[PDB]
């Protein structure tokens, strides 16, 4: 069956056949849409089917479907599974897998870049120290002195689920948050709980507004260990405004490298529970969400206070007006320091071309509208007007519970 | 089956049970979410009637009473005998109120129960329709202090006798393609405006011409009526700080009045049921003025503001978008015409969700539509998980009548 999406701005109509390769569930039924819901050990039993699907895909992509190399590999994986109960990906399959998990990430607006991804194979890693070294190298390579490069580091796969590699941090680089006796938070309220675990695990907290958190690393199902990223490796950008000279005096900065470290990568039924990946920021992630969410740095008040806006009635749109300035400032700052960043007009335009290209070459592009539309100025971006179909393809990135909820302490 | 919705800003979790009364289907499956697609006989009628009368008699705390059974009996007998039935005024009013209560795309539902229902089921001619619509327009405008209203024309009979308002809204601006290649006035209405000209309308060929009504009574061919100009309240758009803004020559109408939808109550279909409330500011300032396919005024405004339009990253679009929206709100408040900003509206809707969750077990809500088209994440609805499902009575989209009419 064919499925058509419409763009209401351009009248362009696309036909999706790729959704037919969807297996995983959406959360929705014919009676309920869960489109705005945030979160909606395998046996050889289910494993070989998942292995076979993946290797068929992989072999198709390299124009070798049905080849002797294809059949041989199938046969080899088959036996490894029934013999060892799992299997090892070849390098080329790991790289292709990781590229495709990104490609299939329907909440990611940056996917025009999916084929340019540096994969680091950290499957020989055995210890937390080993994980720390791998992660440092990723940070350094990805940062590239401001000329950011997409990268992922892939640590050993789940085996019995009792020996998982995990990065406890949700991102490689984030700022500490400290809940105060008076109820106020210092630093980033999103990280209070993780900051507290770090402190518990022995970290001496500077207790400032922008303290880079230490890494908390679990290898082989062992208790996690703390490591501070060399400060010289953590690129940061002071935020100033092109026209407002007082903007610098708000004392704002942000780090350059958005690097997600809490997600699970699935390739051919194998589960990679520690697979940190990084790209570059879209300006709004920082300027809109990190700075302006009420549950985050919540700076709207101070900025509008400094801009002398009419703050008595919301209908003055003082919030909206301060929000644009904060975002101009983020983009200005990153650009001035030559740190890669994309604005939300440019990111969304690119995504639309990528998406159309995906329909032409691939028969679809799964896309989550709730996430793809930027959290400011929604309708003046082309994605607002774009009908999207959301469905789940593997390989994929999945959410996992935070490891402190599941971890069995060895002590 | 018992479902939770979380707000990520506040950690408030609500439990939805109302969805388990979900009647119609979504477009979504276990395999594919269609959350962002805009458009996803005697036998059938009696369960539809019963289900509705059950909810009605439940609402007036009389479920299982003799008056309940007696009406269920009467409607039964009426359907078997006549192949349809008529709602009592009370049932009609309850039904209209609930179609609004159930409109998952409507952010303004905190108001759902203050709705003026005008029963136009006695209407027989397009002139009658015009009279009814003028009175609606006048009552709702109320010299700028807008009041919610719906006017309900006769229900579908055999489908060859539909009442329809051909306009999508009671009040809209004409659109004309120019030899110049561009578009004059509102490009959204170009096709309708041609049909008006072709049915006789004499267009002033101006940028803000109020379209004529095109009214279809009893499945007959539609007729043209101009709404009395003195009933169409309009607002010139000025900025509280940019003196030059007025020179753009922008105005908008005060009355948002949807006239193209289908009201379904207890299985009955009211195909002409224009309804109206009041505007949320972003509807005009963000969508009507700034959509590339609409009045598309961003560039001209940005230029007057002398912003750096050289690169997208200066956020000149965003900067000008904000001003355009300050101006809409400012003008409406200055001319004392009801308008709500998106901060206030979405805040009201969060309070409404809360009431609906405790009082009713949920609230069908479509996030894609509820989150304003500007500054999404700084309004509380952005952070609010919502479940979308279809409850009856309902407003349903229906195809533009010109694609369906036998002339
Ligand atoms: C190239 C630079 C990139 C840009 C500008 C970009 C943009 C974004 C943005 C704006 C989001 C939404 C983030 C949020 O609001 O939380 C996102 C989500 C996502 N991105 Fe991309 N991205 C980029 C690179 C990548 C890379 C390299 C991967 C993996 C290889 C990736 C996979 C994802 C996934 C899995 C999510 C959803 C994560 C979640 O649900 O928490 N992105 N990206
Ligand atoms: C009180 C003033 C009102 C406000 C501020 C309000 C707010 C809104 C907004 C912002 C939308 C989205 C419309 C769009 O973006 O095109 C909407 C859609 C809708 N509203 Fe309300 N509304 C109000 C009154 C009403 C009334 C009185 C009814 C029914 C009697 C109603 C039923 C609907 C329906 C059915 C839709 C979806 C229309 C469609 O799908 O095209 N609204 N409303
Ligand atoms: C590679 C990459 C590039 C880029 N431009 N941005 C990012 C930021 C990703 C990010 C940062 C913070 C928080 C989040 C996500 C939410 N924005 C974290 C999250 C939370 C929940 C509840 C579910 C879920 N699936 N995900 C994503 C990553
Ligand atoms: C009563 C009322 C109050 C208010 N504040 N705004 C409105 C605006 C309603 C409106 C105006 C213009 C256009 C539209 C809708 C689009 N925003 C028209 C439409 C188009 C399609 C394809 C599907 C669909 N379900 N609807 C709705 C109505
Ligand atoms: C409840 C709702 O799904 C939630 O707030 C989502 C909305 N859209 C989003 N979009 C992006 N890119 N990132 C987010 O964190 C969210 N949050
Ligand atoms: C494709 C997408 O569904 C479409 O652009 C929607 C998005 N959200 C919307 N939200 C509202 N309130 N009104 C609209 O017309 C739309 N358009
Ligand atoms: Zn859905």
Curated annotation (Swiss-Prot), chain A:
Where does this protein reside within or beyond the cell?
Cell membrane, Sarcolemma; Cell projection, Dendritic spine
The UniProt record gives the binding positions of (6R)-L-erythro-5,6,7,8-tetrahydrobiopterin as 36, 370-371, 384
Q: How is it modified after translation?
A: Ubiquitinated; mediated by STUB1/CHIP in the presence of Hsp70 and Hsp40 (in vitro).
Q: Any idea which positions bind L-arginine?
A: 171, 280-281, 285
- Describe, from its UniProt entry, the tissues in which this protein is expressed: Isoform N-NOS-1 is expressed in brain and colorectum. Found in the Auerbach's plexus of the enteric nervous system. Isoform PNNOS is expressed in the penis, urethra, prostate, and skeletal muscle, and coexists with the cerebellar nnos in the pelvic plexus, bladder and liver, and is detectable in the cerebellum.
Q: What effect on the protein does mutating residue 281 to F have, as reported in its record?
A: No decrease in nitric-oxide synthase activity
Identify the residues that bind heme b.
108, 399
Quaternary organization: Homodimer. Interacts with DLG4 (via N-terminal tandem pair of PDZ domains); the interaction possibly being prevented by the association between NOS1 and CAPON. Forms a ternary complex with CAPON and RASD1. Forms a ternary complex with CAPON and SYN1. Interacts with ZDHHC23. Interacts with NOSIP; which may impair its synaptic location. Interacts with HTR4. Interacts with SLC6A4. Interacts with VAC14.
This chain's function reads: Produces nitric oxide (NO) which is a messenger molecule with diverse functions throughout the body. In the brain and peripheral nervous system, NO displays many properties of a neurotransmitter. Inhibitory transmitter for non-adrenergic and non-cholinergic nerves in the colorectum. Probably has nitrosylase activity and mediates cysteine S-nitrosylation of cytoplasmic target proteins such SRR. Inhibitory transmitter for non-adrenergic and non-cholinergic nerves in the colorectum.
Its domain comment says: The PDZ domain participates in protein-protein interaction, and is responsible for targeting nNos to synaptic membranes. Mediates interaction with VAC14.
Say which family it is in: Belongs to the NOS family.
What is the protein name given in its UniProt record? Nitric oxide synthase 1
Question: What fragment of the full-length protein is this?
Answer: 299 to 718 of 1429
């Amino acid at each position: 069956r064919f499925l058509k999406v419409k763009n209401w701005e351009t009248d362009v109509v696309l036909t999706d056949t790729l959704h037919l390769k969807s297996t995983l569930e959406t959360g929705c039924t014919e009676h309920i849409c869960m489109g705005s819901i945030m979160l909606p050990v395998r046996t050889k039993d289910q494993l070989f089917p998942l292995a076979k699907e993946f290797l068929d895909q992989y072999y198709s992509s390299i124009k070798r479907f049905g080849s002797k190399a294809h059949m041989d590999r199938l046969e080899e994986v088959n036996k490894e599974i029934e013999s060892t109960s799992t299997y090892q990906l070849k390098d080329t399959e790991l790289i292709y897998g990781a590229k495709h998990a990104w490609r299939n990430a329907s909440r990611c607006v940056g996917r025009i870049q999916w084929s340019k991804l540096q994969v680091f194979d950290a499957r020989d890693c055995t210890t937390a120290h080993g994980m720390f070294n791998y992660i440092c190298n990723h940070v350094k390579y990805a940062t590239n002195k401001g000329n950011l490069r997409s990268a992922i580091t892939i640590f050993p796969q789940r085996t019995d689920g009792k020996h998982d590699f995990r990065v406890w941090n949700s991102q490689l680089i984030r700022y500490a948050g400290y809940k105060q006796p008076d109820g106020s938070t210092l630093g980033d309220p999103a990280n209070v709980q993780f900051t507290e675990i770090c402190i518990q695990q022995g970290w001496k907290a500077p207790r400032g507004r922008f303290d880079v958190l230490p890494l908390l690393l679990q290898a082989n199902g062992n208790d996690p260990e703390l490591f501070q990223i060399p400060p010289e490796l953590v690129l940061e950008v002071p935020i100033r405004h092109p026209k407002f000279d007082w903007f610098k005096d708000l004392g704002l900065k942000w780090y350059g490298l958005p690097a997600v470290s809490n997600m699970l990568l699935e390739i051919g039924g194998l589960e990679f529970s520690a697979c940190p990946f990084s790209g570059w920021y879209m300006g709004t992630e920082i300027g809109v969400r990190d700075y302006c969410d009420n549950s985050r740095y919540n700076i709207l008040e101070e900025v509008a206070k400094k801009m002398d806006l009419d703050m008595r009635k919301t209908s003055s749109l003082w919030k909206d007006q301060a929000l644009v300035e904060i975002n101009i400032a983020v983009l200005y700052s990153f650009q001035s320091d030559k740190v890669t960043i994309v604005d939300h007009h440019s990111a969304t335009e690119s995504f639309i071309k990528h998406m159309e290209n995906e329909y032409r070459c691939r028969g679809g592009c799964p896309a989550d509208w709730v996430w793809i539309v930027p959290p400011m100025s929604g309708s003046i971006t082309p994605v607002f007007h774009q009908e999207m179909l959301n469905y789940r393809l593997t390989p994929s990135f999945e959410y996992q519970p935070d490891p402190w909820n599941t971890h069995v302490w060895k002590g």
